[PDB]
Design a protein that fits this description.
The PDB classes it as virus like particle. The structure is cut from a larger assembly and holds six copies of chain A (189 residues). Chain A is mainly beta and 189 residues long. The first copy, chain A, has no helices and ten strands. In chain A, the strands form two sheets. In chain A, strands 1, 3, 6, 8 and 10 form a five-stranded antiparallel beta sheet that branches. In chain A, strands 2, 4, 5, 7 and 9 form a five-stranded antiparallel beta sheet that branches.
Amino acid sequence: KNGITNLRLTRQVELWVPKDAANASFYVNHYTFDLDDFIPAGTQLNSSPLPFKYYRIRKVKVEFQPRLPITSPFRGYGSTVPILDGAFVTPATGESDPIWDPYINFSGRHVIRTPAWYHKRYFTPKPLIDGNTGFFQPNNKQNALWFPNKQGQNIQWSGLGFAMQKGNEAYNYQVRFTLYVQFREFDLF
Amino acid sequence: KNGITNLRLTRQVELWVPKDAANASFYVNHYTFDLDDFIPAGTQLNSSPLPFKYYRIRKVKVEFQPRLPITSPFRGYGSTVPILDGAFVTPATGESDPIWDPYINFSGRHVIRTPAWYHKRYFTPKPLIDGNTGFFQPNNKQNALWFPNKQGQNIQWSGLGFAMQKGNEAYNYQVRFTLYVQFREFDLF
Amino acid sequence: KNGITNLRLTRQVELWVPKDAANASFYVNHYTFDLDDFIPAGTQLNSSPLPFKYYRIRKVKVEFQPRLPITSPFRGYGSTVPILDGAFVTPATGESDPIWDPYINFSGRHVIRTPAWYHKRYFTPKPLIDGNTGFFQPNNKQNALWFPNKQGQNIQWSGLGFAMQKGNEAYNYQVRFTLYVQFREFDLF
Amino acid sequence: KNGITNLRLTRQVELWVPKDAANASFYVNHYTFDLDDFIPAGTQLNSSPLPFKYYRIRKVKVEFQPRLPITSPFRGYGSTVPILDGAFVTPATGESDPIWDPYINFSGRHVIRTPAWYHKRYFTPKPLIDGNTGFFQPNNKQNALWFPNKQGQNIQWSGLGFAMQKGNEAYNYQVRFTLYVQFREFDLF
Amino acid sequence: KNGITNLRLTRQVELWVPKDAANASFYVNHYTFDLDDFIPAGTQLNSSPLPFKYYRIRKVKVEFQPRLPITSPFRGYGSTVPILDGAFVTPATGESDPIWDPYINFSGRHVIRTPAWYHKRYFTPKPLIDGNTGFFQPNNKQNALWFPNKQGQNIQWSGLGFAMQKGNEAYNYQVRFTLYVQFREFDLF
Amino acid sequence: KNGITNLRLTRQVELWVPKDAANASFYVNHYTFDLDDFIPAGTQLNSSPLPFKYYRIRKVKVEFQPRLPITSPFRGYGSTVPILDGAFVTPATGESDPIWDPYINFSGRHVIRTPAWYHKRYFTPKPLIDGNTGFFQPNNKQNALWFPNKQGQNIQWSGLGFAMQKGNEAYNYQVRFTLYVQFREFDLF
């Protein structure tokens, strides 16, 4: 019969890092993945671009791809972490983002060598359901738990919190999210 | 990975058999199955109700279900055959459908006991591509040959030719087609 | 010690199917089972007809028993499905119930031969708790999960969605629900 | 299936022992256990606090718990026996309870050290049906014989005959009966 | 690496039992354990006395230690039970606490010999999350389920319901709670 | 039980190297690691950011990360050594830092390729207790000796002495210290 249907969805987001007048201040932001933002925008001839009902995200692969060449006049050394519970340390509005690194002492701290070097994280995310009561239950062999696919009402899955060092000149990354989704119960009319 | 996706599509067609003034004449018609007629009509919110690209029909199950009870004042004994090449002996317009049975001496002649008895045929159809040059190539283990799914331009697959005896009073069947389709290469945007 | 207490509760509901003036339109309704409706009504000498605290429904057996004899002047062929998540396709008020079958292409589509033939479904239901967040978790060996028995506040368990064809004359079924309940923690005072 | 349902019912009775002006006279009374007196009194919302039909008493555990501390100015040494046929030697009204011990030479004479010491008997009782014709039939592996549970018409089961020595000052015990009842044939409506 | 961190927290509560004018009435109260009440009060130099994030309670050990000596002029015999779902039978305000024992027929009824005798219960509690939908799921090898430690917002864990007999004179116990907590994910800044 | 608690603390220090007018003179400095400087500054809500009592440093990982790109107009070749006894050859104030390399002939002389190339040292440090009388006792399987954690009074652990060549233009490194600390005897109030 028809048990599992793999898919590999991909989106690309530009990521601007503004300049800084030699304060060596960081710029922190967080990433969440939700399945309704990975469809190509505009293509709305049929209302169900994903015609299944039950889905789960197996792996997320986040690629920080650069734009500047390797002979940039200034390097910088930030850190990315996989956050699996949505407790980011991201600043508020007008918080004046910290001079000291907030993502420096975490458990899965990978180092990203900004602004001219590729950086790949490949992990398993967890949902942000907000009714999970708080219990973690450490790794259950890649989150074997199916979720009902609702077109436009999907939950978010918490992923990378990156903290990249602002430099003397502003620069640009191209970030590429890939989700290795599994699907079940094809329900076309 | 994701090789095959089974599906089980179903449609229902009313089948009227008009009366006859004791001539014992038959009423012959033929059936072809095409995938664009098995979707539910009206549901057109997204233009692709079948979001795959390559398909094949494994089995077709045609059920003649009756309407009259078993105490009808007149029986009748027709014949159904699986035609696998589209060479039906169906009458033309105004042909005055034959008094003798046309589907009596065929190879797979099953007998249907009209008008109050169930009758099931379960077989493998063949396409009507009209560019196959004529060669048959007897059974290749259930027609392992994939076809490109075009929305509204699909080919027909030849199936039952039924020849049911007209009686003294007109009656009604409910015919139910089921296709056990296989699919491949999910191509959603 | 005293682990499990089996019980076999039974109720009977009349089911009327109104007539139709040769439109071959269907009549769709859905069934849910809740434990507080299976007690005999009127017998209220003690406030706890079920003196346990933890319960679960193992199997539900729904029997469509007929009333008309087998020599009825008109047959009809409907479909029953086990719905395990409460997503029935039942019409609204004044929806003018569909001419085409809504329960024709489902996974567990059994065919009921109305109006003179017995029809039995025997399955495992799932609760309708509305706080299950959406995950299905396919069959966990007959839903080993106990629920607190509250007298008059019990949850519903989603079962059959039947869609039976309306005929030329109105008719009647007698539907019989049986629940094979298990119980635990006898808590009498 | 559902064969046996264990239960552990418990009641507590105050037991007063009046004083005596240095005659060293005893005070003899007998105990019988009947299932309709072990329910909590007042709780009458449903008329069947025990919703089974067939029952038997496996063990009875009678605990004499004291009230006075161990530094009482006077001890005393009585005797308890398990009577299994209702032939107690208890006094009549105005009999002026005997100066010599009546329960001194019996077969299962346990000694209770009154008035400051715990005393536990744990045995199997026998019914007082009064139509048993007199035959005893020594121990049949814990009286495997079921009895119909009638709400308010139950038979008595003969147990302890205790004979405790009256002292110079009146005192108090708290006696606690426990029945390890088995049940069968749950018959709720 | 660093998986589990055991801890053994302890608090002490005085427990007064008021007098009674020879009615032999009980005094019932219930106990719940929450982790934010087990820290020493006043010591607030750093805002996180427990610097972990995920915790669970393995065992709770409740010790009723007495104050009166063993030569008290009046004994008494109460009962403690481990309640694991928060359904205590505790009285309301002005309910005039019952003359008959409410905790007499429960499953884990231990007897406490008041007012001069030690009494220890040692068990596993369950949370009172109020969104658990009601299912019990009997013992899963000591509640392997982690909970997020929130400073001042922690959930309660239901434990002992004790029912101790009031006497002729008021008295005093010293109750000592011990929690054998496990911890995970040390998250200091 | 709870024996060892690993932690991985991290701090980052900017390291400026001033220019030189073609004398090819070096610039020598030394590094010591003390646990009270690795906490995030400002976060002082609770007075104990490390709530243990006994600690030891297993490994120190010092990363010299660059700032200039690899196409700098001038290279340079310095040397780092692990000093394990605090006998650095660092200059005094106004010493006019030597034209010849002081760290050239040592035992563990690694070469750092300044100013555009990463450089990692990963070793075990030794304390600077100043009461050790002078004896070395060569490697005792990674300094199995616990030290009492005093908040603000901790001893220093001697590490890298680096000697990096000054160039024609001033430049900048970002140095990152990581300590793989072990902890014992959690002593929270």
